[PDB]
Amino acid sequence: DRPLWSPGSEPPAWLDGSLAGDYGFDPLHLSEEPEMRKWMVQAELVHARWAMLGVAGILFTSIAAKTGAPFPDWYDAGKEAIKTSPAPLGSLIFTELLLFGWVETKRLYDLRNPGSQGDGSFLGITDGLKGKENGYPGGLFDPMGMSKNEASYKEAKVKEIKNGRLAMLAFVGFIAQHHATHKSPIDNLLDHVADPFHVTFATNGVSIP
Amino acid sequence: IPTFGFLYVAGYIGHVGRQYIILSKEDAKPTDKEIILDVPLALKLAFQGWAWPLASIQELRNGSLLEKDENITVSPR
Amino acid sequence: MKDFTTYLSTAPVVGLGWAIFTSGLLIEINRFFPDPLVFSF
Amino acid sequence: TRAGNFAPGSEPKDYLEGLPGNYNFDPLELGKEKGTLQRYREAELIHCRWAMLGAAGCLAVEVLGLGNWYDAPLWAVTGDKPTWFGIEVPFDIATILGVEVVAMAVAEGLRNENQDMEKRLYPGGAFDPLGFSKDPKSFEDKKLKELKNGRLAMVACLGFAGQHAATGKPILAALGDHLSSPFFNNFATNGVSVPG
Amino acid sequence: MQGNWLPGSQTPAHLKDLKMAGNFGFDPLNLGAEPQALRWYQQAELVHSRTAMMGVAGILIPGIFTKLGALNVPQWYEAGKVYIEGEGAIPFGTLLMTTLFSYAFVEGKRWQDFRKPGSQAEPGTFFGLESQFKGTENGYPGGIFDPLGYSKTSPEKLDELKLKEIKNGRLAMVAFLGFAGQYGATGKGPIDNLADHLADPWHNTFAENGISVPGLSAVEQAA
Amino acid sequence: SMQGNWLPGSQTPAHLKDLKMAGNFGFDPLNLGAEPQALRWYQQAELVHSRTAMMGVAGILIPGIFTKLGALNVPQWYEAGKVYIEGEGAIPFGTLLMTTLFSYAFVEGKRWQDFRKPGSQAEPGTFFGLESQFKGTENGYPGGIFDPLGYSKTSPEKLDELKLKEIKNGRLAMVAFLGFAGQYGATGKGPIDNLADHLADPWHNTFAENGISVPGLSAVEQAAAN
Numbered sequence: 001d002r003p004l005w006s007p008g009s010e011p012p013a014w015l016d017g018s019l020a021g022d023y024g025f026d027p028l029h030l031s032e033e034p035e036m037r038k039w040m041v042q043a044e045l046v047h048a049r050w051a052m053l054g055v056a057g058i059l060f061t062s063i064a065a066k067t068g069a070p071f072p073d074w075y076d077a078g079k080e081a082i083k084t085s086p087a088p089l090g091s092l093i094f095t096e097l098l099l100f101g102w103v104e105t106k107r108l109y110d111l112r113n114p115g116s117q118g119d120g121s122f123l124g125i126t127d128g129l130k131g132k133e134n135g136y137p138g139g140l141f142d143p144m145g146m147s148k149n150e151a152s153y154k155e156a157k158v159k160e161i162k163n164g165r166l167a168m169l170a171f172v173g174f175i176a177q178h179h180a181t182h183k184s185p186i187d188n189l190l191d192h193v194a195d196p197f198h199v200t201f202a203t204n205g206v207s208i209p
Numbered sequence: 210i211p212t213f214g215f216l217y218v219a220g221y222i223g224h225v226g227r228q229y230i231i232l233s234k235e236d237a238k239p240t241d242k243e244i245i246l247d248v249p250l251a252l253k254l255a256f257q258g259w260a261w262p263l264a265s266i267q268e269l270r271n272g273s274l275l276e277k278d279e280n281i282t283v284s285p286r
Numbered sequence: 287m288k289d290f291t292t293y294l295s296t297a298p299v300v301g302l303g304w305a306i307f308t309s310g311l312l313i314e315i316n317r318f319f320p321d322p323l324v325f326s327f
Numbered sequence: 328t329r330a331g332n333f334a335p336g337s338e339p340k341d342y343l344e345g346l347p348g349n350y351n352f353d354p355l356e357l358g359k360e361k362g363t364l365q366r367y368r369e370a371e372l373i374h375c376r377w378a379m380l381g382a383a384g385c386l387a388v389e390v391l392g393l394g395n396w397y398d399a400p401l402w403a404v405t406g407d408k409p410t411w412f413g414i415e416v417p418f419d420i421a422t423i424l425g426v427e428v429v430a431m432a433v434a435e436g437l438r439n440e441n442q443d444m445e446k447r448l449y450p451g452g453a454f455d456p457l458g459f460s461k462d463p464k465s466f467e468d469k470k471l472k473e474l475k476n477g478r479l480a481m482v483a484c485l486g487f488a489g490q491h492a493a494t495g496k497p498i499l500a501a502l503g504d505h506l507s508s509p510f511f512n513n514f515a516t517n518g519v520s521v522p523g
Numbered sequence: 524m525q526g527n528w529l530p531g532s533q534t535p536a537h538l539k540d541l542k543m544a545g546n547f548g549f550d551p552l553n554l555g556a557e558p559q560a561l562r563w564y565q566q567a568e569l570v571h572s573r574t575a576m577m578g579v580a581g582i583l584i585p586g587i588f589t590k591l592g593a594l595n596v597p598q599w600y601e602a603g604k605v606y607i608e609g610e611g612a613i614p615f616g617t618l619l620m621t622t623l624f625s626y627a628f629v630e631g632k633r634w635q636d637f638r639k640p641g642s643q644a645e646p647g648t649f650f651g652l653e654s655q656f657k658g659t660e661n662g663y664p665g666g667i668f669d670p671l672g673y674s675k676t677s678p679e680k681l682d683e684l685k686l687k688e689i690k691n692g693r694l695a696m697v698a699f700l701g702f703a704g705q706y707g708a709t710g711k712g713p714i715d716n717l718a719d720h721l722a723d724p725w726h727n728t729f730a731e732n733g734i735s736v737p738g739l740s741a742v743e744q745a746a
Numbered sequence: 747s748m749q750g751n752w753l754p755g756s757q758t759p760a761h762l763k764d765l766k767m768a769g770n771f772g773f774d775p776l777n778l779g780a781e782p783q784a785l786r787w788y789q790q791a792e793l794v795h796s797r798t799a800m801m802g803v804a805g806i807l808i809p810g811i812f813t814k815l816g817a818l819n820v821p822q823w824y825e826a827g828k829v830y831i832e833g834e835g836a837i838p839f840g841t842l843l844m845t846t847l848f849s850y851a852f853v854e855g856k857r858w859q860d861f862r863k864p865g866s867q868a869e870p871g872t873f874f875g876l877e878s879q880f881k882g883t884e885n886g887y888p889g890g891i892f893d894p895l896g897y898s899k900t901s902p903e904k905l906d907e908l909k910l911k912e913i914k915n916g917r918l919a920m921v922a923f924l925g926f927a928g929q930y931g932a933t934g935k936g937p938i939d940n941l942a943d944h945l946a947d948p949w950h951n952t953f954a955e956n957g958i959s960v961p962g963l964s965a966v967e968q969a970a971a972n
């Protein structure tokens with residue numbers, strides 16, 4: 001009744017198609033327990049969102065570098081950023097660690113007990129900072145969005161998870177062909193468009209001995 | 210200072226082993242729990258054993274640490 | 287996952303996890319810090 | 328009795344109706360409970376009043392040509408005679424700090440023991456010697472005027488802090504720069520307020 | 524319905540009975556099946572077309588006046604640098620800060636009107652003149668935006684005006700895309716490209732230039 | 747009863763839910779206060795750790811603040827022991843430590859015997875007749891001569907508010923003293939100089955920047971710089 005990851009395959013019993021992007025691909029039987037199922041859903045959502053954010057930032061920086069603006073490569077960007085950054089190394093990572101620890105244990109204890117942070121303990125807000133779904137919060141994180149409508153929310157969930165998986169593939173592609181070519185992903189794309197019949201993953205010397 | 214440094218960790222292992230033994234003994238077929246460990250309770254007790262000497266002193270005064278020998282197997286000499 | 291993680295919770299794996307954790311902890315302490323003799327801070 | 332809409336066509340909240348300075352501004356449901364809402368109203372009133380005090384201190388020191396507000400506490404660093412309105416008060420820095428802390432500690436102590444939610448906004452009586460608050464219409468009007476002038480005082484104090492963080496020139500020199508070269512010298516031309 | 528983007532093609536079900544100017548059934552990807560998505564995409568296409576109409580106007584009409592020799596105005600692709608390098612140059616940082624602030628103030632009103640139509644006519648908001656800021660139709664506010672009054676006519680004239688607007692807007696959008704492609708390919712303005720195509724039609728072709736179609740020149744030299 | 751929470755969403759221990767306490771936030775993951783007067787003893791331990799931490803921190807900042815303002819030439823707290831001992835009006839360290847130990851043992855002996863039996867120090871004809879007011883009305887809250895201004899004989903709802911204010915400023919000074927020893931251990935400077943350094947230059951003056959608190963992080967900065 002659903003398009004699976006392989007046509008004619010047997011979908012898992014714990015994957016009933018009620019999740020976003022539920023293509024029934026799970027050969028290692030992970031997320032079988034419902035608590036770990038929720039934990040895997042949360043982990044996939046946050047890894048997906050960070051993959052899309054990092055891929056978008058990498059693409060924007062590489063496009064700006066290709067257009068002539070002074071921008072670093074997606075690799076060693078922070079290495080040449082810190083020497084001009086007023087914030088030194090050490091303090092920056094620790095500040096982001098403290099702040100992200102605050103946000104992430106807040107959302108962690110929201111995951112453990114849904115609606116636990118909607119009691120007004122954090123600056124007296126009740127409707128906000130309360131989880132609407134498994135890996136989907138509400139209140140502050142939906143300023144104008146159409147999550148009120150159920151069908152549009154489901155379509156946006158499917159779009160978000162598919163874009164997330166595409167961004168994971170994009171990030172592994174980024175690191176792989178950066179180690180292959182030592183060039184920007186936009187430079188690799190322009191090389192592929194310029195000479196598709198010869199420039200590829202096979203004629204780079206490395207990865208094809 | 211290494212003397213108190215070792216004794217803190219030595220009392221840490223003894224306390225978490227005692228709490229796991231006590232917790233497992235109030236459970237059906239407790240002999241299985243020694244060969245089938247449970248992770249969430251053992252890890253919770255592992256991270257709740259920093260104040261081992263504070264738990265050890267309070268149990269010493271009130272008899273929960275020790276046991277009178279009327280329920281202790283003793284030799285028939 | 288439950289059927290496999292029940293096996294994962296038995297003593298031989300616990301005989302590794304504690305061993306790997308404590309061994310690696312002592313390797314990293316003896317690696318990043320040199321070999322000392324006195325706990326004079 | 329709304330004083331206006333912060334956004335034309337904004338979604339109305341069910342709590343910002345019977346409060347002075349109501350513009351339905353709150354976008355993120357802050358202070359949804361009334362117990363936090365009253366405390367937030369009192370705290371915003373206290374920040375706005377202190378902002379009026381700070382704006383007056385930073386403006387009367389410059390329209391009279393007596394120095395810069397940031398250069399005023401530099402006397403504790405160099406160690407010379409402090410000056411207020413050309414009188415040269417001889418009190419020591421430790422003495423004025425020590426009397427300040429105890430004096431406004433007692434002041435906020437008598438402010439804190441009110442236990443009445445309506446008394447934590449406008450005291451009246453002893454704090455209102457002239458007393459133009461006998462009629463309710465002028466009372467509400469003056470409440471609205473106080474809150475609006477205090478909000479712009481608050482954003483002006485934050486603008487003072489940011490402008491001195493970017494450039495060393497004071498507020499009057501910044502006003503002269505905007506009146507002389509607005510397009511060629513503004514916040515965008517600093518290079519430290521915005522990157523690039 | 525009038526015309527067709529592709530005669531004989533299967534029409535999506537969300538455009539068969541839709542009353543909107545310039546509907547030709549051009550949605551093979553079905554991106555506008557949702558009515559809210561249709562409204563948002565209609566507004567987005569409208570504003571894209573309007574900004575492109577100003578864009579191609581400021582590209583073409585000063586270019587035509589340059590060709591006639593009435594004004595010494597330069598080309599559009601280099602106008603930025605010749606304004607930056609001028610003596611009466613507002614700095615680039617100040618310019619884009621002013622542009623972003625002004626257009627953010629405009630588009631906040633646009634978004635708040637798109638959320639609730641006609642909700643911008645609340646009294647005592649825009650200094651008393653907001654009573655004519657109410658929206659008669661999504662994407663078409665009216666009021667001070669039409670002071671002369673060509674929209675206060677019969678409806679059968681109004682949809683024709685809407686059709687003319689959206690058609691010239693799509694023409695302007697594809698024209699701006701052509702301007703960008705021609706600057707990226709030939710490096711000259713639209714007036715020079717038009718003059719070259721009028722003078723030498725066969726020699727001044729996009730297939731002759733190797734930027735648009737790489738590898739075609741090697742085939743031409745091989746033949 | 748319960749006010750606030752140290753960690754929203756965490757499981758509260760059963761001995762902390764319906765418990766009337768000063769500054770209770772459910773912060774006991776180790777369940778040390780499960781038994782009732784065991785928590786009474788640790789309540790007195792928390793009160794007496796905080797009260798001497800309040801005086802200790804106030805003895806560090808207020809002389810330190812006045813040193814910055816230049817009114818007094820009082821030295822820093824870490825070198826104040828060697829400053830007084832090397833002076834020409836110095837009581838010897840052995841005499842001072844014996845006098846401190848003897849005076850506190852007498853005081854803490856009365857405090858201890860009050861804990862085991864509440865109100866036991868009010869036996870007549872023991873402390874020259876003034877021990878009648880030495881009866882503790884609450885564990886850790888003796889009253890009597892310790893409150894001569896009558897600031898505790900008020901409404902009950904004001905009393906726990908003062909108790910909550912006492913434990914909150916008590917805990918705040920208690921983590922402050924740990925910061926004071928840690929900042930002397932890492933930076934080697936007083937808290938006033940450290941506060942001025944963070945105010946004037948926040949990014950470059952951080953515990954992460956100092957290699958003492960986090961070893962090896964400076965080598966990461968050096969490796970990333972090269």
Ligand code: CLA
Nearest residue numbers: 049056059060132136137138141145146147156157159160
């Ligand atoms: C484009 C991918 C995408 C999509 C489809 C969604 C969809 C959704 N998210 Mg999600 N989200 C995303 C990315 C995305 N998100 C990222 C990257 C983050 C991290 C910042 C989050 C953080 C987040 C939170 C914290 C929450 C959601 C929620 C939601 C729901 C609200 C519906 C809504 O408003 O639509 C969202 C529509 C969009 C995102 C489309 C806008 C795309 C813009 C136009 C892209 C352009 C901006 C980009 C930076 C420019 C790229 C430049 C590049 C070309 C170089 C819905 C399921 C909420 C929810 O589920 O509540 C029930 C919720 O609480 N999301």
Ligand code: CLA
Nearest residue numbers: 219222223224225226227228229230246250251252254255
């Ligand atoms: C944590 C559990 C635990 C505790 C509290 C004790 C406590 C005691 N044992 Mg016992 N012991 C244990 C486990 C334990 N033992 C195990 C597993 C063995 C088999 C190797 C022994 C073998 C043993 C002998 C042969 C003797 C004692 C003796 C003693 C006493 C001396 C203290 C000491 O350090 O002994 C030394 C203990 C050892 C050398 C055993 C070390 C083995 C490790 C450290 C135990 C691992 C337990 C594990 C980590 C707990 C699980 C944690 C949980 C979270 C899952 C004391 C009453 C002596 C006695 O009678 O004194 C009066 C004595 O002669 N014990």
Ligand SMILES: CC(/C=C/C=C(C)/C=C/[C@@]12O[C@]1(C)C[C@@H](O)CC2(C)C)=C\C=C\C=C(C)\C=C\C=C(C)\C=C\[C@@]12O[C@]1(C)C[C@@H](O)CC2(C)C
Nearest residue numbers: 025026027028029030047050051054057074075077168171
């Ligand atoms: C691909 C990936 C994970 C893939 C996992 C796979 C296939 C697992 C497969 C299976 O599990 C299934 C499905 C089901 C199981 O039954 C079986 C197996 C077989 C086990 C994750 C990527 C995850 C990728 C992520 C999260 C990427 C994040 C990127 C970020 C944060 C970027 C940050 C940057 O710092 C950089 C790097 C450099 C700077 O220049 C720029 C900035 C922006 C600063």
Ligand SMILES: CC(/C=C/C=C(C)/C=C/[C@@]12O[C@]1(C)C[C@@H](O)CC2(C)C)=C\C=C\C=C(C)\C=C\C=C(C)\C=C\[C@@]12O[C@]1(C)C[C@@H](O)CC2(C)C
Nearest residue numbers: 354355357374377378381384385396397399481482484485
């Ligand atoms: C108290 C104050 C000013 C105090 C001034 C003082 C003491 C001045 C004294 C001196 O200057 C003199 C006279 C002379 C100098 O020589 C010495 C000093 C000592 C310097 C300003 C407050 C200033 C306070 C400011 C600017 C607050 C800004 C807050 C913002 C923007 C928040 C936005 C929100 O929208 C969110 C994000 C979420 C929404 O739910 C709602 C809200 C909460 C509204």
